[PDB]
Amino acid sequence: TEEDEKAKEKIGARVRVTVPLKVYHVVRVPEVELMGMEGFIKDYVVLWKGKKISANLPFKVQFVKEIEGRGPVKFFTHLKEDEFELID
């Protein structure tokens, strides 16, 4: 639980995506490139109601992206530790 306690500390921290990565679940945005975008970690989804889950993308990260003609859309995407860097 020493990698889980290390990971739990990062909840709420600001991150930036360091690798090219496209996601398709943002509502009414068919495709989003996440390389360079900034958000913060909202959860470490490996831990769930006292139990442990075998999620390969354990960090649920909140992003807001500006869409022309419509306004900021808020969404979540799960990331691996090697796909983002912490900010300051």
Binding site: V23, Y24, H25, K49, K51, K52, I53, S54, A55, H78
Partner: protein, 113 residues
Amino acid sequence: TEPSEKSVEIMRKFSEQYARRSGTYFCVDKGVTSVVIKGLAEHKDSYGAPLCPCRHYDDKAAEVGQGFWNCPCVPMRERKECHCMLFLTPDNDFAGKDQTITSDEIKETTANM
């Protein structure tokens, strides 16, 4: 051990509908498609959700509750990555050209299994 035909037909119809809606195609080996669908059906029978059949779990009830690996898994919904090779993007060397699989195809392909 074997899934009921009610769960197989649900998952068969979902996979046809999810393939067109995601722009993905079934594998050229339609045995992979039928087997995976049956694995989703069996997990839905035993836990109420189609847990991924190509993952090993420690706590299947918790996995169903959290939902990460309930099909379509988070990686498929977000990145169009399906490691059971059920939904394949067209640039995949194993992607066929079909987004349909009949119930007859599943019955002959999985025979004697």
